[PDB]
Amino acid sequence: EIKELLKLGDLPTSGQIRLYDGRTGEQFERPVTVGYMYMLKLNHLVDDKM
Amino acid sequence: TEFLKPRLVDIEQVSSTHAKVTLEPLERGFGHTLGNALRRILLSSMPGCAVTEVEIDGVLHEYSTKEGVQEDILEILLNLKGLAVRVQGKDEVILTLNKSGIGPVTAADITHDGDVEIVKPQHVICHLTDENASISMRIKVQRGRGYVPASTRIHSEEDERPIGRLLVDACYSPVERIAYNVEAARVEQRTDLDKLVIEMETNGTIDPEEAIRRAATILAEQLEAFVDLR
Amino acid sequence: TEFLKPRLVDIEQVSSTHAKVTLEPLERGFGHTLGNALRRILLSSMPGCAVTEVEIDGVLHEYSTKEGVQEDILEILLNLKGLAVRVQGKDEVILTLNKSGIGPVTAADITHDGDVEIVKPQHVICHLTDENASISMRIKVQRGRGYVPASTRIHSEEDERPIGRLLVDACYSPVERIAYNVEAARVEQRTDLDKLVIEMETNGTIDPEEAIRRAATILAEQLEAFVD
Amino acid sequence: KPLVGTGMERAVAVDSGVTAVAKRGGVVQYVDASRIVIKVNEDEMYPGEAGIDIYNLTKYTRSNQNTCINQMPCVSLGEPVERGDVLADGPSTDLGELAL
Amino acid sequence: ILSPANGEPIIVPSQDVVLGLYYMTRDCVNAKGEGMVLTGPKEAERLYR
């Protein structure tokens, strides 16, 4: 089912794409995963430790 | 030694923001060098204008609410961070907003000066939900480059400001997204040449020709201290 | 526009071929732009003269051998790439090598001319075990650009070579190694600016600072059609 | 909101009693950044009063771990409201879904 | 750099550097530049780059 979704929006089925590089402009040798995680703060801030 | 030079050829405005710039001919191995050099210096060193102080009457700090306004004031500040102006002569201006009556308050009815160009006049700022409500604001607009937060500015400055100036973070750079592409060109018998195609997505405030010329200028100026001396 | 530009601090020379150059301070993120542009220009697009094509007597193919020579011919065709040459008048010219007897065959024993300079006369080519053996070959040297291997050339050429023509890798560009490096520096309040430390190593025919300024000139001369 | 959840966002966001839920059906009368006044339907009005409900939202306030509690109105002016809906997102909700 | 419990070194390279060292030094059967000859490590660097 998840692969049917991925193929409905014209995205690669395997899940991983080609990433270039930022500093030199070359291509990374191999495909790389890309997606959308959902992540959280936590209140162990630094301004309360130093 | 068959060196050859590029010339800016074609500009094709897809829309009011998107734009594609072609550039040829380039000998082999020079598509990527120029492409990546000026990709790196367009995303960080362009000059543009953005809002940096807001004064709204009858409000003391940025955590209160107001009579007959949908948003609380943090939301008004976070909506003002992203309007796009274009200033011709000065380097700082004071704009004024003033409205009354039910309805949405958009950016169209900033009382324009003589030489301030507002790009999108259909960008919403507030909502007024009562017939007696009114709102009146004084915005300041400056010029600079890069990213400058509010903490740095408050700690640098020694000047004293009253209870009621509210400081906003600034984000001056106008260019949003940029991606280049190298393709094979056609010249009479030289099949060795190339062509470069840069596609550029920004708000208003920059006409692309000027963007590429400024990038090339600062690159050549940087190399100058690197040719002559040793 | 409130630009910032550097004051070339150090050039500390190790020998006639090595060098390393620091430079400080550059705006944030201008280390990698300059380092990368220079490195690509140096490796791929400099002009120079070097050996391409060889004619050895009594040799037919890359596998064979010639009696009275300590090496194979693979060792010969490797010893014959580092031969650094300078031609000033022509675009291509031909050397002839003729030797006999026992002894290492250095580069000085070659038939030299007026307009061609060999910058390391002590360079070795081959040995001769048997004093009854001689060697006689002729060498082709051409002027070009970049680096061009041999498989590409042989795929390109279908010409019916006179059986005995062997083809070498060219090494036109006069740089052995270049590598940059970017690390952090400071100006009074700001601890973001970058210092750049390039490290360069070329053969003869060019002193390093000469190579760097010629490369920078190539790139600026490319850009000259936008600034104005 | 979260792009991938397990269907039980809405129950935790509502039953935790931190979002202001409608008390009786009606149509919204007056919406402001700090109170909403709603007018009940005729069928739900017992005949004593005139039938208006008034919700006073709680703006910035201390939570006893030293963080900020505030509420935002979630409906526009003049649109109907049925019993059991949400009228004001809480500290960490989004249209009645736990968004954390 | 030697632990006093038993003279085994205590700076073993940990978990990410070892994968780089392991991806450099391996061999594929087809890649390119198959079977041509070089003159040192430096020309190998130039060719790879």
Side-chain angles (χ1 to χ4, degrees):
Chain A
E1 307 201 31
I2 187 179
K3 286 179 176 177
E4 292 180 354
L5 263 173
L6 281 172
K7 196 182 40 151
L8 193 151
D10 308 279
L11 297 178
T13 308
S14 302
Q16 47 191 43
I17 62 171
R18 296 212 327 279
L19 274 295
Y20 295 174
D21 193 346
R23 283 165 326 173
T24 66
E26 321 207 319
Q27 180 179 346
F28 282 169
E29 304 269 322
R30 298 177 68 188
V32 174
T33 294
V34 172
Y36 282 43
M37 270 284 258
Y38 177 95
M39 51 185 38
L40 319 168
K41 177 72 76 173
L42 302 175
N43 61 10
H44 304 291
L45 306 167
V46 178
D47 285 314
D48 304 341
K49 313 287 189 181
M50 186 184 78
Chain B
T1 308
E2 310 300 325
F3 60 91
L4 266 176
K5 293 178 173 63
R7 298 184 73 70
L8 199 151
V9 167
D10 199 71
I11 298 172
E12 192 263 9
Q13 213 85 20
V14 176
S15 173
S16 165
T17 66
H18 206 275
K20 288 182 189 176
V21 187
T22 311
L23 188 154
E24 71 179 2
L26 298 179
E27 275 198 343
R28 297 261 323 260
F30 276 93
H32 292 279
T33 300
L34 287 182
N36 200 6
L38 54 85
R39 181 179 181 271
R40 277 184 70 93
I41 65 174
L42 273 71
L43 286 148
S44 69
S45 304
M46 298 281 80
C49 292
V51 162
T52 189
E53 293 185 3
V54 181
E55 183 178 1
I56 170 169
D57 63 358
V59 166
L60 308 166
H61 48 87
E62 50 194 321
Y63 301 85
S64 59
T65 66
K66 190 168 178 175
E67 292 283 329
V69 173
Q70 185 79 39
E71 287 89 4
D72 43 348
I73 294 170
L74 272 172
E75 210 67 13
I76 293 170
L77 277 297
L78 296 205
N79 277 121
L80 286 178
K81 272 178 64 175
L83 61 83
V85 305
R86 185 188 287 180
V87 184
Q88 313 270 12
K90 277 74 69 177
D91 288 336
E92 85 165 345
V93 189
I94 294 90
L95 280 67
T96 301
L97 169 63
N98 193 307
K99 178 163 217 290
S100 309
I102 297 170
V105 172
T106 53
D109 65 359
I110 299 283
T111 66
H112 63 87
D113 293 18
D115 62 347
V116 169
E117 181 88 27
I118 287 185
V119 179
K120 61 196 311 205
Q122 64 183 357
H123 163 62
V124 70
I125 290 180
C126 288
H127 278 84
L128 284 168
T129 65
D130 184 8
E131 182 84 50
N132 305 356
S134 72
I135 189 173
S136 61
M137 312 175 38
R138 290 185 290 285
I139 298 90
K140 180 197 276 198
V141 166
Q142 306 193 2
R143 179 175 292 171
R145 81 179 192 273
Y147 175 46
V148 174
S151 174
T152 286
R153 196 178 28 236
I154 189 174
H155 295 352
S156 71
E157 181 41 82
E158 61 177 1
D159 175 66
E160 194 79 329
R161 72 185 192 275
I163 291 163
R165 295 286 202 271
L166 281 70
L167 289 174
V168 185
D169 294 336
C171 297
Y172 299 97
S173 72
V175 178
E176 286 277 325
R177 185 181 70 83
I178 185 167
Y180 66 92
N181 193 340
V182 172
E183 208 169 356
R186 188 268 183 277
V187 177
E188 298 187 357
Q189 293 82 17
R190 297 304 310 284
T191 187
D192 193 277
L193 313 185
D194 269 1
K195 72 190 287 184
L196 192 59
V197 163
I198 304 169
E199 61 186 280
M200 185 180 289
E201 177 167 358
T202 185
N203 45 356
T205 310
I206 294 295
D207 184 77
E209 163 81 19
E210 199 195 301
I212 289 172
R213 285 186 184 270
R214 205 179 310 281
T217 288
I218 74 171
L219 193 56
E221 174 208 342
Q222 280 297 338
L223 264 288
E224 182 174 89
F226 194 84
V227 175
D228 270 315
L229 180 59
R230 325 287 276 298
Chain C
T1 184
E2 323 294 325
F3 41 97
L4 200 154
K5 68 171 46 57
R7 287 76 48 88
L8 182 153
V9 163
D10 177 1
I11 300 170
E12 62 86 19
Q13 202 153 328
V14 176
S15 170
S16 297
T17 61
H18 202 90
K20 75 187 290 189
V21 165
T22 62
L23 202 172
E24 159 175 327
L26 301 177
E27 270 274 359
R28 182 185 70 176
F30 277 94
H32 286 289
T33 296
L34 299 180
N36 193 11
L38 273 296
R39 186 220 292 136
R40 282 185 82 98
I41 287 302
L42 274 298
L43 277 70
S44 302
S45 302
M46 290 263 277
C49 306
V51 169
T52 304
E53 193 67 329
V54 299
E55 299 294 328
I56 308 174
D57 185 8
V59 178
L60 277 296
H61 62 87
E62 296 82 2
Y63 308 90
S64 174
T65 189
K66 182 176 187 180
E67 297 283 61
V69 179
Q70 194 293 300
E71 310 299 347
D72 294 336
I73 77 171
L74 261 177
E75 307 273 28
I76 294 176
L77 266 56
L78 289 175
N79 274 347
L80 214 60
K81 292 207 293 179
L83 190 64
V85 179
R86 303 207 308 256
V87 184
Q88 63 84 30
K90 284 262 201 53
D91 286 332
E92 69 85 21
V93 70
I94 296 90
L95 279 298
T96 69
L97 186 54
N98 273 351
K99 189 36 171 303
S100 306
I102 277 170
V105 183
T106 68
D109 300 340
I110 211 162
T111 56
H112 72 282
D113 297 331
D115 54 354
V116 59
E117 290 283 333
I118 307 170
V119 305
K120 206 202 177 200
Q122 173 184 40
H123 185 72
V124 189
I125 289 176
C126 68
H127 294 285
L128 293 177
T129 61
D130 184 2
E131 51 84 19
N132 307 117
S134 74
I135 190 167
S136 196
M137 62 173 98
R138 54 186 179 272
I139 304 302
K140 170 178 267 194
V141 58
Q142 275 165 200
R143 168 180 279 162
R145 163 170 275 151
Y147 183 103
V148 172
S151 66
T152 293
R153 205 192 291 85
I154 190 164
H155 287 89
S156 64
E157 278 287 321
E158 65 175 359
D159 193 4
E160 302 298 326
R161 285 185 293 271
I163 306 171
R165 203 160 91 180
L166 316 171
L167 73 165
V168 190
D169 297 336
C171 191
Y172 296 106
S173 167
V175 167
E176 297 283 332
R177 195 175 80 95
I178 189 167
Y180 80 98
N181 199 337
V182 165
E183 62 186 342
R186 188 194 55 104
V187 165
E188 278 87 7
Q189 183 54 340
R190 314 151 81 181
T191 304
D192 291 331
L193 319 184
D194 284 19
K195 75 146 77 168
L196 178 142
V197 187
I198 75 180
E199 174 163 3
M200 192 190 181
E201 185 157 313
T202 182
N203 57 5
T205 62
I206 289 289
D207 178 71
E209 288 91 13
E210 173 68 29
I212 305 185
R213 68 173 62 89
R214 288 217 273 131
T217 285
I218 281 179
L219 186 139
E221 185 271 331
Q222 277 279 297
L223 274 178
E224 202 50 36
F226 296 137
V227 184
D228 297 327
Chain D
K1 64 184 181 293
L3 284 177
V4 180
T6 62
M8 185 179 288
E9 323 282 337
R10 210 171 295 268
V12 163
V14 160
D15 298 337
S16 172
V18 67
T19 71
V21 297
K23 187 65 63 66
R24 280 179 287 163
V27 70
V28 187
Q29 173 94 330
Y30 162 79
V31 177
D32 179 340
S34 77
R35 68 199 297 246
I36 65 171
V37 164
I38 190 170
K39 181 192 198 50
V40 296
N41 276 326
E42 190 64 29
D43 307 333
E44 302 214 272
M45 191 155 38
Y46 59 88
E49 62 296 340
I52 57 164
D53 305 334
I54 292 177
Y55 297 94
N56 289 121
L57 308 173
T58 64
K59 286 294 181 210
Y60 299 141
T61 309
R62 200 178 87 98
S63 69
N64 61 7
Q65 313 279 342
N66 295 333
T67 51
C68 203
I69 302 308
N70 77 324
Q71 288 179 345
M72 292 195 178
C74 197
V75 293
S76 76
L77 193 148
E79 66 173 1
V81 160
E82 197 71 26
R83 182 211 301 203
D85 288 328
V86 307
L87 306 170
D89 302 329
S92 191
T93 66
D94 176 8
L95 268 160
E97 291 193 351
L98 196 73
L100 198 46
Chain E
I1 65 180
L2 277 80
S3 168
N6 55 5
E8 298 289 339
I10 199 54
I11 55 177
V12 308
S14 299
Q15 89 176 19
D16 189 355
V17 61
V18 70
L19 191 153
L21 272 296
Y22 176 82
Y23 181 82
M24 289 208 317
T25 65
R26 198 191 166 118
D27 52 349
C28 198
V29 73
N30 77 305
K32 57 166 71 175
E34 188 77 14
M36 70 188 191
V37 294
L38 313 189
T39 64
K42 284 176 274 293
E43 164 165 0
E45 187 150 1
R46 276 211 276 163
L47 287 190
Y48 160 54
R49 193 72 63 175

